Amino acid sequence: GAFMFTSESVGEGHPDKICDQISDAVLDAHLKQDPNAKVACETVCKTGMVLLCGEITSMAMIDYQRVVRDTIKHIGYDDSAKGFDFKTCNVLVALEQQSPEDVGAGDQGLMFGYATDETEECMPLTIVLAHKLNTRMADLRRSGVLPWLRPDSKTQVTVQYVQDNGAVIPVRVHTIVISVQHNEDITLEAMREALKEQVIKAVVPAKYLDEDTIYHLQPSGRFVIGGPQGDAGVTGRKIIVDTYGGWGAHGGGAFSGKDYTKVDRSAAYAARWVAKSLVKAGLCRRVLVQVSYAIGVAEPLSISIFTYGTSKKTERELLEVVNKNFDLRPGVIVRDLDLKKPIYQKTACYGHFGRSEFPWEVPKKLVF
Amino acid sequence: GAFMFTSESVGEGHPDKICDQISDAVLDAHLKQDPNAKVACETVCKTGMVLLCGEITSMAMIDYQRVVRDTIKHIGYDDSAKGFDFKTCNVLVALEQQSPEDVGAGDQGLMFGYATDETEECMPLTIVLAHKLNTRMADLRRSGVLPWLRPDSKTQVTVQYVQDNGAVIPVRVHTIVISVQHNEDITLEAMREALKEQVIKAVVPAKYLDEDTIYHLQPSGRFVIGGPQGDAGVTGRKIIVDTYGGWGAHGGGAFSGKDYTKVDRSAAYAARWVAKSLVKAGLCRRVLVQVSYAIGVAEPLSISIFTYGTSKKTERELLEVVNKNFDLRPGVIVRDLDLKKPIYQKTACYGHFGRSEFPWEVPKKLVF
Amino acid sequence: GAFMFTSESVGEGHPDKICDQISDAVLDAHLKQDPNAKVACETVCKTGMVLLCGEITSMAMIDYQRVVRDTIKHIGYDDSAKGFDFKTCNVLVALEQQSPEDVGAGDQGLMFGYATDETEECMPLTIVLAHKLNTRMADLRRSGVLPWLRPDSKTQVTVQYVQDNGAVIPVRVHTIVISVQHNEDITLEAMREALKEQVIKAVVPAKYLDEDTIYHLQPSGRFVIGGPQGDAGVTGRKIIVDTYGGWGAHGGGAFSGKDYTKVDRSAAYAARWVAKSLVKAGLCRRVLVQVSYAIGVAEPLSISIFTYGTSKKTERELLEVVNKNFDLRPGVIVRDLDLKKPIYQKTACYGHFGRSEFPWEVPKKLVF
Amino acid sequence: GAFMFTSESVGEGHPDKICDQISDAVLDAHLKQDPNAKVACETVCKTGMVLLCGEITSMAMIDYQRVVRDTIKHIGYDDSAKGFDFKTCNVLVALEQQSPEDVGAGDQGLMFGYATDETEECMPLTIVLAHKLNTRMADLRRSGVLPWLRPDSKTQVTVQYVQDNGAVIPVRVHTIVISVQHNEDITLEAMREALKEQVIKAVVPAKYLDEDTIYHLQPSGRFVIGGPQGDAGVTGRKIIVDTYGGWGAHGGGAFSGKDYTKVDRSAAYAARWVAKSLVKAGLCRRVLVQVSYAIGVAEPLSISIFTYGTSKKTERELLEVVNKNFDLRPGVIVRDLDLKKPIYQKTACYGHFGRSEFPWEVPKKLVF
Ligand SMILES: Nc1ncnc2c1ncn2[C@@H]1O[C@H](COP(=O)(O)OP(=O)(O)OP(=O)(O)O)[C@@H](O)[C@H]1O
Ligand SMILES: Nc1ncnc2c1ncn2[C@@H]1O[C@H](COP(=O)(O)OP(=O)(O)OP(=O)(O)O)[C@@H](O)[C@H]1O
Ligand code: MET
Ligand code: MET
Ligand SMILES: [K+]
Ligand SMILES: [K+]
Ligand SMILES: [K+]
Ligand SMILES: [K+]
Ligand SMILES: [Mg+2]
Ligand SMILES: [Mg+2]
Ligand SMILES: [Mg+2]
Ligand SMILES: [Mg+2]
Ligand SMILES: [Mg+2]
Ligand SMILES: [Mg+2]
């Protein structure tokens, strides 16, 4: 039942993603000394100018200059011409820091969860490839293979699909668009060649690459001193690339900069968890689990499972499977998923869902 | 086939929405003197401090201090204690301004469109009510009826649904959460009373209000000097409340601050247009139209119509209906929808979809 | 030998003076936990926006948000309309903080010292009155006597003089100009009356007030919401009001924000010390002691005493008196004057010279 | 009657001087299109971040981005590593601009004027050399002779003097300290050599250079990426280097950023004018003319001439000479000195007094 889809992703150098990382870096820096630290911060950046804002109630001694500059360094901004230098950029800290199981969900909410068997990650091929494409570029950048490669990049992958008496089966990569920052001493012809052979063909399964597959490598020509500027960088502005690439559903809640007590993050992770567990357990080929919460109440206020006719069990058979295998209460979520651990920075880029190294990405057994 | 859903919305005073409005205000200010003005700007705010960033190629003389301060005034920030005063706030303008039908879509893209017959607006009841709830508060604020009401507010509406051999029929409002800024001389008991009788019951259809409907009015107590700080307001960070409240699909593209030449805005409007037209023409009760574009190409690169079994015509009968009634090329979109007109500021709050006063909200005939 | 002179001073609310205080407040906050803390910081402010910049090598835990906001509170900025509220203003900290007798003067330098017997403070009458005028207003403000009085103020005092076979004898106050911020509920007539009776006549010696003395109280009319804005506030920009009101000599070195290791502060204090000691010891009625240093060298590189023919001893009689009573080496200065003590904030306003509560203002014995 | 003196100066790259220039650049940009433009602005900078503040009532169309960036370019900040790049730095404009002979002096004031015959410029040798030292470095920088030389520099000159039955005769240059920013590819040994032979010895008269003269060239080692940060540059913070290097007297008034209607600038210029005219006319070898003004009154409120016994005429013979040759009223000053002309930027660096190219530096005839 043919249709096509497109998804995107951005590198660690993207203005918005730098803020997402810095914000989560500050979250990590607190969890390491106080796992109960209340973090609520965000970052704004604009050409060698980083503004750290936020309200964080914690009891740990942190050098914000150090955590911000170290994060910028990690990203690859050490030289001037790159559009950012951790040693010279302005780090204005306007941060306010205080000191002092059946909890109860804060703020009325509605979190979504999604999973599909089109890839081993249980994530849309389009977004998976989009992320992996950026990931590979960072590898070649940090390894030395492609020393002209710079931190800021953007990726878009559009794949042609076809339904199947249930749902979504990828057929081939229709077109790929990739833009990456770079050094001056490297020709546009050499860049486009390396992007096709060393990055695209080194991550995209042969089955999907075609003789007609369209490539748009460095479409706008050069992107040298571009760097993280883009008029300004902000936290929580890359909401769709952090999730399913426009495939599931999204209420609008941002992750980065918020601790484990905010249902926007925790519950979203939990919903992904059960979604991935369901398909992994063969109970369905594609699911959209919807978990609702009521302010004050701990136990979820109605969870809905949305298979697209890919399950044999039948919604409200699968719900009991979830109700017998999962305890989606806020407090239990953080305990079961180990959400007091400082893994948030690595979650701030290349997507929150998909990578198996995260607790919520490890499928639960599911006793049926 | 019961399930519940929740959606939210924010008032004109919300930090993020202030930036969305200011950014669009600058867009309007340019279109009035140069309908071909290229606008690409964004705003950042934090307690009496507004930063205007952006690259705009236009040929019009604009007083940015005036357009920013006037917008803050319109919102209702004229006094000190409110958290913003257009006469005293810092307006730092870092804006860069230059001077000099079958066009061709910029940037590979994938826009979504959605519409449902559960309301006359052809929008989800949950988000419609959420918007109207905030709208009413602004009315009572500007009329004088509720003079304690201040600009910043947040609304959440969760409605219980039930499918119907096709899709989505609202049953009742399960719970409503509303928070609004306010003056000091007004008791929490009087506020909660006015919110229930004068705002909620004055906008929510009797059919949906219940004896069990849960109300959470000013849950966190007092919201006095809670003016636009919310730890830095930003443009394009309220992506879901500007669209369908998490009901359709969203690629992640922001509207505010971008002119009519960016497919992220125009094409999204166009997709909503055809979606609304389809249901209005009786061709379906709920649609998710998906329009894809290819960088360089003008004519859309595959449009998909997604009814949920609510149409009798059958997808790929409805597609020809769309292909015979619509010309979704970028240039034609702006011409047909009159996208060179300065209506963007009023679009920057209370949702981009739903209100009939916008071109894309006027259903096309559809000759079948 | 008649001539006239004018001097000025500003209140604790003056934008520049707020920065001078905040900068010294941060210096005090470090000395209390590490008397060897290396402080080099400055502040910038602009309508509810404070920027703390600087490089300080210390080993003490300081809450910059607390030291900045507490300083703004002390000044009297607690309400909105005053142009500053310590609870709501933006405190952007871009501060960089590290951790780890015959020393030797840093930076080639030339410090000046001045003293005259026209007042018990051994300071020019014009500047003394200018300072005391602002001091009194702060008292009436903090006591409650004049509750309409606000933090920001400016004072100018012009006195008619006459030489005397040696130098400078004040005759009468020619004119007085005073401007002070204020609350709305207070008439311009009542303000000008209180300024003349309760502040001017309560500080200016009867001998100097005349029937012709000109008064300019609140010349520019109102100064309500003025507050610390004045387009921006800066540290080290009120160099002359911090010293002798334009009577001695000034190389241009700023005090506030610099620790005791900078000869600009320490040596300037030392030079004032010897100047005051000389006149107090009857060795002269007016002196301008000039102390020069050489980078690397500890012992002063030539000290010059400049009496205006008011001494009977004779320059190079008085120099030996200084060389036998004083050891102006940097390290000795800080030890003798107790410059590791946190008294710098109170030094940041109303003048560095004149007030006896400071070590350098206590005359040394002088054995001749 | 031996004594020594020291003075300093800074290059066009010094943070404070950049702001002084930018502020005056904005003043020039207005005078060219509206000679009656009311300008009152100031600048703040910090590592690729320039903030333009101010209130200017004018009727001219100015591109502040252009005037700020052009000024930074002129200074020599075009590359990244230099600590500033006019093409990439953040120019935040928070400027507010409106549109619409016997005048009368604004604000009670007291301006000083000074002149000495120790040099042809009628300025202290110490400050003259200090300025010329920086000037020469800019020449070698812009010519190409010393291509490693960068914009930011600081100079200090200490000369040994001796009185002479009247006053001040320079004997020799005791020591010279000069620090200048530089490129990486240049040894500290080569820099110090070029500073002594090509800059110092090319500007300092043979008569003053000695075999004992002490040189401190690049004392602190390397000054590479030391571009304009210096922990925030500011306008009006280099008050003494803009005048007499600590030789005359200074009330504290800043020049840069203020138009010709502010007595702080105009009257100060006028006072220098008469001082220079007096010595040039042989009426004295050293003068300190003091001109006082009264708010509202046009005609100066008492002018005092202070010779140090170097005049044969006798104070109150010279006063009539001034009263018969000069009309120091504000309005007349601007007319006679042509103060509506855009020459203020070149006045913003290397000193306001001394250079003959300025109106106030052209001695008036003086008919006696
Ligand atoms: N000077 C400008 N002219 C036109 N568009 C601009 C300009 N500056 C920024 N933009 C923006 O870029 C968006 C569309 O194109 P594009 O996606 O190529 O930008 P980017 O710089 O690549 O952004 P990102 O990393 O999110 O893609 C628009 O929404 C528009 O606001
Ligand atoms: N809008 C403006 N028009 C004219 N002058 C201004 C304006 N804004 C600020 N000023 C400044 O004030 C100076 C002269 O007058 P005045 O001393 O009354 O200012 P203030 O606001 O009182 O300053 P301070 O506290 O140092 O006196 C000038 O140098 C000028 O730069
Ligand atoms: C040649 S423009 C490329 C810039 C890139 N879109 C960015 O993220 O800023
Ligand atoms: C009526 S204007 C007075 C303001 C005052 N000069 C200040 O310091 O800002
Ligand atoms: K945007
Ligand atoms: K968002
Ligand atoms: K100034
Ligand atoms: K100064
Ligand atoms: Mg980008
Ligand atoms: Mg591009
Ligand atoms: Mg994007
Ligand atoms: Mg002031
Ligand atoms: Mg005034
Ligand atoms: Mg002043």
Short mmCIF file of C-alpha atoms and ligand atoms in Angstrom, two decimals, chain A residues 237, chain B residues 20 23 41-43 235-237 254-258, ligand 5:
data_model
loop_
_atom_site.label_atom_id
_atom_site.label_comp_id
_atom_site.label_asym_id
_atom_site.label_seq_id
_atom_site.Cartn_x
_atom_site.Cartn_y
_atom_site.Cartn_z
CA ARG A 237 13.67 22.87 20.00
CA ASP B 20 6.59 33.42 18.53
CA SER B 23 9.02 37.08 15.57
CA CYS B 41 14.19 35.70 12.52
CA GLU B 42 13.66 34.41 16.05
CA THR B 43 13.31 35.88 19.53
CA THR B 235 10.71 30.90 19.31
CA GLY B 236 9.64 27.64 17.71
CA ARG B 237 9.59 25.72 20.97
CA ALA B 254 8.59 25.55 13.28
CA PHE B 255 6.34 28.26 11.79
CA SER B 256 6.89 31.57 13.58
CA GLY B 257 9.67 33.77 12.25
CA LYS B 258 9.70 32.20 8.80
K K E 5 12.02 29.33 14.39
#
